[PDB]
Amino acid sequence: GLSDGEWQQVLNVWGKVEADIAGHGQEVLIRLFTGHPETLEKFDKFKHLKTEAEMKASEDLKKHGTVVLTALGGILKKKGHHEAELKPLAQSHATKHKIPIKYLEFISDAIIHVLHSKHPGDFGADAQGAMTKALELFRNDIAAKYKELGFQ
């Protein structure tokens, strides 16, 4: 649960992402795949990528980066009122993609890393706190749906 001041910070930071959603999305996925190679194995259409250069050169990875952050942005813009938006994502990730909640923790931290990397000195302590809380909220609500489904 975030305050309005905190949501304000979240949406302020998100303005940075929206100026270049494909670049951000690309770097998030790259940070995830290289940081946690087991995540790569969940993607049939990226499992071919062995090296980070191939990742960096992949237009389809950038495309998926756009899809992911577009979806996340839509959810963030709801400021917590995201049940309709989130449920199908929780369902597809638990039942079709079989993504453990741990991997959602991974990508959450990856977003934090990428924002610092692309905006050094421009991602303040207050901003990080707000973004972190927003991603925790997202993760926690997904986690509730995972429990419902009995998914590990």
Q: Is the dihedral of CA 146, 13, 32, 45 positive or negative?
A: positive
5 vs 18, beta carbon nearer ligand HEM: 18
64 is known to lie in a ligand binding site: yes
- Residue-wise over 70-108: b if at least 16 C-beta within 10 A, else e? eebbebbeebeebeeebeebbbebbeeeebbbebbebbb
In whole angstroms, the minimum distance from the beta carbon of 13 to ligand HEM comes to: 15
Radius of gyration of the chain, Cα coordinates, nearest whole angstrom:
15
Per-residue binding letters, 6-45, with ligand HEM (x by CB under 6 A): ---------------------------------x--xxxx
Q: Which 67-96 residues touch ligand HEM, going by CB under 6 A?
A: 67-68, 71-72, 89, 92-93
Residues with Cβ within 8 Å of residue 132, at least 6 apart in sequence: 108, 112
CB-nearer residue toward ligand HEM: 39 or 58: 39
- N residues, the chain: 152
Q: Which stretch binds ligand HEM (CB under 6 A): 4-12, 98-106, 112-120, 143-151?
A: 98-106
**What are phi and psi for residue 105, nearest 5 degrees?**
-65, -45
Q: Give the binding site for ligand HEM (CB under 6 A).
A: 39, 42-45, 67-68, 71-72, 89, 92-93, 97, 99, 103-104, 107
